[PDB]
Amino acid sequence: TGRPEWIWLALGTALMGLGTLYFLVKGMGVSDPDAKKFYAITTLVPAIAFTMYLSMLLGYGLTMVPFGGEQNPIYWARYADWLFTTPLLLLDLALLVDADQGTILALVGADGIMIGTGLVGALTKVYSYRFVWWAISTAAMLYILYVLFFGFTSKAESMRPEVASTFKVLRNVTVVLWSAYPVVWLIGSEGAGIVPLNIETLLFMVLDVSAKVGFGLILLRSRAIFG
Amino acid sequence: TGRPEWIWLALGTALMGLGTLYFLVKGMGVSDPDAKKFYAITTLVPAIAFTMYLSMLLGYGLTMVPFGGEQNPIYWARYADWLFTTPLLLLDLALLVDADQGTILALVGADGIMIGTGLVGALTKVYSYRFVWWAISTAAMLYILYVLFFGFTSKAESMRPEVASTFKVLRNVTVVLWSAYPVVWLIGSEGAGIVPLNIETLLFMVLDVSAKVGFGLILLRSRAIFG
Amino acid sequence: TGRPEWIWLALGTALMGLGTLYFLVKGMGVSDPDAKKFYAITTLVPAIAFTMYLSMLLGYGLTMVPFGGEQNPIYWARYADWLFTTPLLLLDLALLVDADQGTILALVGADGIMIGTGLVGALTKVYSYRFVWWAISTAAMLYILYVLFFGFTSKAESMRPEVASTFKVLRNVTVVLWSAYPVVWLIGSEGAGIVPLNIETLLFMVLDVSAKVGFGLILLRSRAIFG
Numbered sequence: 001t002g003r004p005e006w007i008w009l010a011l012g013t014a015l016m017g018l019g020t021l022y023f024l025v026k027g028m029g030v031s032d033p034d035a036k037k038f039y040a041i042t043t044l045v046p047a048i049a050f051t052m053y054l055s056m057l058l059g060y061g062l063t064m065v066p067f068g069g070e071q072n073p074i075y076w077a078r079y080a081d082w083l084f085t086t087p088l089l090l091l092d093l094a095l096l097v098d099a100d101q102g103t104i105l106a107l108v109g110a111d112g113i114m115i116g117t118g119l120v121g122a123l124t125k126v127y128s129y130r131f132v133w134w135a136i137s138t139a140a141m142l143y144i145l146y147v148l149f150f151g152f153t154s155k156a157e158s159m160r161p162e163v164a165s166t167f168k169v170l171r172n173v174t175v176v177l178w179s180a181y182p183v184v185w186l187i188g189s190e191g192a193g194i195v196p197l198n199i200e201t202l203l204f205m206v207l208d209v210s211a212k213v214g215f216g217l218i219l220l221r222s223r224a225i226f227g
Numbered sequence: 228t229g230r231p232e233w234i235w236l237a238l239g240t241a242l243m244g245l246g247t248l249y250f251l252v253k254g255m256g257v258s259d260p261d262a263k264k265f266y267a268i269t270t271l272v273p274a275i276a277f278t279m280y281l282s283m284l285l286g287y288g289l290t291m292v293p294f295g296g297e298q299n300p301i302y303w304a305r306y307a308d309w310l311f312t313t314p315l316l317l318l319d320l321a322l323l324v325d326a327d328q329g330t331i332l333a334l335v336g337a338d339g340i341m342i343g344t345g346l347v348g349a350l351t352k353v354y355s356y357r358f359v360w361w362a363i364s365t366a367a368m369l370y371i372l373y374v375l376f377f378g379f380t381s382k383a384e385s386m387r388p389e390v391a392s393t394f395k396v397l398r399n400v401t402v403v404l405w406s407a408y409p410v411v412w413l414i415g416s417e418g419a420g421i422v423p424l425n426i427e428t429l430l431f432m433v434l435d436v437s438a439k440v441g442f443g444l445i446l447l448r449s450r451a452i453f454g
Numbered sequence: 455t456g457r458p459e460w461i462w463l464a465l466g467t468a469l470m471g472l473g474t475l476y477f478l479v480k481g482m483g484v485s486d487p488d489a490k491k492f493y494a495i496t497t498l499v500p501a502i503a504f505t506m507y508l509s510m511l512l513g514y515g516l517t518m519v520p521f522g523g524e525q526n527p528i529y530w531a532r533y534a535d536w537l538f539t540t541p542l543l544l545l546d547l548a549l550l551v552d553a554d555q556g557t558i559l560a561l562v563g564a565d566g567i568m569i570g571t572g573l574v575g576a577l578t579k580v581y582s583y584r585f586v587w588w589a590i591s592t593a594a595m596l597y598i599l600y601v602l603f604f605g606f607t608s609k610a611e612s613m614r615p616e617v618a619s620t621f622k623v624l625r626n627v628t629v630v631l632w633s634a635y636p637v638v639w640l641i642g643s644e645g646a647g648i649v650p651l652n653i654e655t656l657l658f659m660v661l662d663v664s665a666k667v668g669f670g671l672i673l674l675r676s677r678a679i680f681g
């Protein structure tokens with residue numbers, strides 16, 4: 001239920017919160033117009049994650065969903081967080097590699113579908129169907145990781161070595177991180193109950209902090225963001 | 228009620244789904260930077276339509292609304308679909324004719340109002356009021372079709388003949404299609420019950436497929452999208 | 455409750471409505487590409503405010519929220535209105551002063567957080583918590599007003615005198631207006647009950663009309679919008 005995992009929600013709230021604080025301070029004296037955007041996109045991610053986590057901790061981001069034949073606690077705020085967060089992360093990778101507009105809109109359009117479809121599946125009352133959505137959602141993710149891995153990498157090979165290499169790191173980091181979500185979702189209480197909500201929450205917590213603080217850290221402390 | 232029309236929802240789900248598949252494959256080997264955006268915008272439309280239709284078919288996109296003095300099944304997913312879909316269609320017409328930013332924001336701003344206001348009217352419990360919203364919504368649509376017909380046409384006359392002519396086709400096609408919605412809505416169960424939900428669903432189904440697959444077809448198979 | 459203040463909702467609906475009408479007509483014969491965007495952004499604000507107010511008047515934008523130990527009428531449509539409105543107002547100030555993209559995304563990202571967080575607090579059932587959100591929301595606002603006052607002003611000093619001065623006016627006007635919201639919210643039925651809903655509604659009404667009609671008036675009637 002929504003009680004014993006409060007500690008993961010509390011610890012995550014704190015980390016995202018501190019995560020925002022640091023980026024804000026770190027980006028204080030940046031004049032480079034390029035880096036400026038990077039700081040904006042990257043700082044906005046943990047900030048949002050902060051408010052969504054706090055809402056899960058205080059209770060607002062938790063709802064109840066019946067399926068299988070029981071009342072299941074679903075943290076919808078997770079999706080609300082991701083819905084705005086993932087596009088930004090994507091935007092970072094794109095600026096860095098200088099992606100085309102068509103491809104950005106495609107990636108972003110695909111991303112909303114991944115989360116929207118994911119949320120839908122989390123709120124679907126027919127236990128069976130929940131897995132269709134998971135499927136459609138995961139497909140969208142693969143499309144995104146495909147374009148990021150091959151599409152972007154190829155695009156980064158024309159950038160100066162600092163960029164090509166920083167991106168590479170971020171590339172591997174996102175590919176590994178992003179794919180853990182559909183797996184965590186699948187084994188957690190939202191899907192095939194194989195791991196308790198308490199663990200599910202902890203797993204997503206580590207994943208969210210890594211994706212919104214780690215990623216930012218790796219990027220914002222690189223020279224790559226300077227034009 | 229929400230049962231006998233399942234077949235229109237199923238057939239539509241299939242068409243949008245196939246609609247996405249084809250565009251994805253067709254845009255596979257496109258290198259032209261212009262066409263690329265076109266494929267992105269146009270492919271994203273049926274994809275979204277796919278997920279929204281599937282949700283109506285599985286039951287998620289259906290809700291119940293009391294008014295007149297009864298429980299009325301309202302497919303809110305239709306609006307959710309249109310909310311993201313219409314801006315994109317508009318974006319296509321704009322890129323094609325090279326519209327100004329002010330006019331795009333205006334058209335898009337007007338579009339959200341058309342759908343938002345339409346949805347509101349679909350969820351309004353006071354039977355009487357439902358028609359005010361329909362009115363406000365239809366006004367917004369007219370504003371859009373006005374700008375598209377005169378504003379854009381004039382803008383397309385400066386483009387190469389392929390563009391001016393392709394646009395023209397799309398222009399007539401959207402003007403005719405878009406205006407059928409406020410009429411279908413008005414005579415269907417969501418408004419003045421003159422046609423059963425079963426027909427209403429079928430009518431919107433034909434309209435959605437034409438607007439998201441036909442339009443894409445006409446455009447994506449034209450030379451117009453190449454810079 | 456949601457009845458005696460209907461007059462403020464009615465009067466506001468009317469003003470926003472007339473507000474849109476005037477801007478539409480005033481921007482009819484504008485050819486300047488710069489001014490065009492300004493008219494678009496500025497006209498779209500009262501239009502949205504119109505639909506949201508009308509929804510509060512008709513009843514749709516009102517909901518009930520228990521907290522403190524009672525049923526409290528909460529006009530969520532206020533937040534829905536602001537959510538789309540404030541970014542636009544911000545966009546106006548930015549175009550006028552020629553702000554960077556990083557700073558716009560930052561301001562807009564901060565703005566959504568201010569409203570999103572504000573709405574959350576308005577729907578939070580735990581009376582106590584409602585004030586945390588108010589706090590987080592108000593912080594975001596200060597961040598925005600900070601950047602607008604110092605950041606933008608500095609940016610406007612490089613524009614021609616008409617712009618620098620018009621902006622200045624708008625600058626003082628928004629700083630004074632925006633900060634009245636968190637105060638009105640705090641003393642109204644949504645926070646520390648010190649003023650009845652009837653007054654709260656009237657206060658926000660004056661504030662919304664000033665922000666969406668006054669601001670537009672001051673700006674749209676200035677030469678500043680011409681490139």
Ligand SMILES: CC(C)CCC[C@@H](C)CCC[C@@H](C)CCC[C@@H](C)CCOC[C@@H](CO[C@@H]1O[C@H](CO)[C@@H](O)[C@H](O)[C@H]1O[C@H]1O[C@H](CO[C@@H]2O[C@H](CO)[C@H](O)[C@H](O)[C@H]2O)[C@@H](O)[C@H](O)[C@@H]1O)OCC[C@H](C)CCC[C@H](C)CCC[C@H](C)CCCC(C)C
Pocket residue numbers: 044048051059060061062063064076079080083084087088517518519537559562563564566567569570571573574577
């Ligand atoms: C700028 C754009 C153009 C912005 C877009 C903003 C918006 C559309 C995004 C929201 C995202 C959506 C996708 C997620 C929503 C999920 C939704 C399906 C689930 C609904 O719940 C959330 C919603 C409703 O709350 C409710 O208010 C109603 C009206 O008063 C009530 O009727 C509902 O019942 C109420 O729901 C709550 O309470 C339920 C409680 O039940 C109780 O539980 C207790 C437990 O102890 C006990 O059991 C009681 O007995 C029992 O009754 C609970 O179960 C429900 O779950 C729920 O809590 O809330 C509003 C969501 C808010 C808008 C999201 C915050 C968003 C953040 C702050 C925005 C920052 C983003 C900016 C925009 C990005 C900037 C950068 C860009 C450039 C990318």
Ligand SMILES: CC(C)CCC[C@@H](C)CCC[C@@H](C)CCC[C@@H](C)CCOC[C@@H](CO[C@@H]1O[C@H](CO)[C@@H](O)[C@H](O)[C@H]1O[C@H]1O[C@H](CO[C@@H]2O[C@H](CO)[C@H](O)[C@H](O)[C@H]2O)[C@@H](O)[C@H](O)[C@@H]1O)OCC[C@H](C)CCC[C@H](C)CCC[C@H](C)CCCC(C)C
Pocket residue numbers: 063064065083105108109110112113115116117119120123271275278286287288289290291303306307310311314315
């Ligand atoms: C990127 C942006 C910044 C993105 C914006 C995303 C978001 C804000 C868009 C959503 C759009 C809005 C406008 C439409 C919402 C309509 C809303 C008013 C209606 C609410 O329903 C939908 C919502 C809630 O579902 C629910 O979960 C709650 C929490 O757990 C519950 O409390 C609710 O009750 C529950 O509602 C469901 O179940 C009801 C069931 O009742 C039962 O019915 C059965 C029938 O047999 C039987 O009778 C039972 O007895 C009875 O109890 C049902 O009646 C309700 O209708 C409902 O099903 O769901 C969330 C919506 C989801 C977010 C929309 C999918 C969006 C897609 C995938 C996004 C793709 C878009 C991208 C963003 C675009 C990219 C391109 C751009 C560049 C343009």
Ligand SMILES: CC(C)CCC[C@@H](C)CCC[C@@H](C)CCC[C@@H](C)CCOC[C@@H](CO[C@@H]1O[C@H](CO)[C@@H](O)[C@H](O)[C@H]1O[C@H]1O[C@H](CO[C@@H]2O[C@H](CO)[C@H](O)[C@H](O)[C@H]2O)[C@@H](O)[C@H](O)[C@@H]1O)OCC[C@H](C)CCC[C@H](C)CCC[C@H](C)CCCC(C)C
Pocket residue numbers: 290291292310332335336337339340342343344346347350498502505513514515516517518530533534537538541542
């Ligand atoms: C383009 C983008 C990518 C666009 C984004 C659009 C979208 C996501 C934005 C919405 C914004 C969100 C943030 C606000 C939502 C607040 C939400 C938490 C609160 C929920 O209520 C609103 C929602 C649901 O209505 C409902 O339908 C459900 C399904 O059928 C029902 O299950 C719900 O119960 C029902 O809720 C209503 O009714 C309740 C009634 O109870 C009754 O009250 C009477 C009183 O006499 C009596 O007591 C009865 O006994 C009692 O039962 C009531 O209490 C509830 O409050 C509610 O009324 O409605 C949908 C919202 C709609 C989408 C917002 C309008 C938006 C406008 C028109 C859009 C214009 C914006 C464009 C996009 C901007 C363009 C420019 C850009 C460039 C910046």
Ligand SMILES: CC(C)CCC[C@@H](C)CCC[C@@H](C)CCC[C@@H](C)CCOC[C@@H](COP(=O)([O-])OC[C@H](O)COP(=O)([O-])O)OCC[C@H](C)CCC[C@H](C)CCC[C@H](C)CCCC(C)C
Pocket residue numbers: 017018020021024025027028030031036039040041043044047048050554556557560561563564567590593594596597600601605
């Ligand atoms: C519990 C808490 C931990 C959680 C926090 C609560 C949180 C929810 C509320 C905060 C809002 C937050 C969400 C918003 C974050 C936005 C973030 C994305 C911003 C990234 O930042 C990008 C830039 C925006 O661009 P700029 O103004 O154009 O830069 C000017 C530069 O000098 C170039 O000038 P040139 O062009 O002429 O050459 O920030 C502008 C740079 C400015 C010069 C510096 C601004 C000063 C700041 C006000 C101070 C930094 C903040 C401090 C850590 C204090 C924290 C208080 C906070 C809560 C307001």
Ligand SMILES: CC(C)CCC[C@@H](C)CCC[C@@H](C)CCC[C@@H](C)CCOC[C@@H](COP(=O)([O-])OC[C@H](O)COP(=O)([O-])O)OCC[C@H](C)CCC[C@H](C)CCC[C@H](C)CCCC(C)C
Pocket residue numbers: 100102103106107109110113136139140142143146147151244245247248251252254255257258263266267268270271274275277
């Ligand atoms: C039930 C089903 C029917 C429904 C489908 C399920 C669906 C919900 C999930 C899929 C996600 C979908 C919503 C997302 C669609 C996005 C769409 C808008 C994309 C449009 O496409 C635009 C471009 C993006 O731009 P680019 O990468 O920059 O192009 C590189 C070019 O070579 C130029 O290089 P240069 O600049 O150096 O000169 O697609 C990039 C071009 C790439 C080179 C080609 C990419 C290969 C693709 C992975 C293969 C195409 C897909 C296949 C049909 C397989 C379908 C599987 C799908 C489910 C993932």
Ligand SMILES: *C\C=C(C)/C=C/C=C(C)/C=C/C1=C(C)CCCC1(C)C
Pocket residue numbers: 082085086089114115118119134135137138139141177178179181182185207208211212
């Ligand atoms: C906080 C930041 C990130 C990087 C969040 C990423 C989230 C995902 C990649 C989620 C993926 C999902 C899939 C593929 C299918 C089931 C539902 C999920 C939303 C968990």
Ligand SMILES: *C\C=C(C)/C=C/C=C(C)/C=C/C1=C(C)CCCC1(C)C
Pocket residue numbers: 309312313316341342345346361362364365366368404405406408409412434435438439
């Ligand atoms: C799927 C694509 C398109 C082109 C959808 C278009 C939808 C409309 C033009 C809807 C118009 C409406 C009006 C004008 C008023 C009543 C409600 C509607 C939303 C149906």
Ligand SMILES: *C\C=C(C)/C=C/C=C(C)/C=C/C1=C(C)CCCC1(C)C
Pocket residue numbers: 536539540543568569572573588589591592593595631632633635636639661662665666
């Ligand atoms: C209609 C236009 C404007 C300018 C609306 C502005 C709204 C705000 C500045 C609201 C601020 C809030 C804060 C800071 C905290 C409590 C909740 C509010 C949303 C009222």
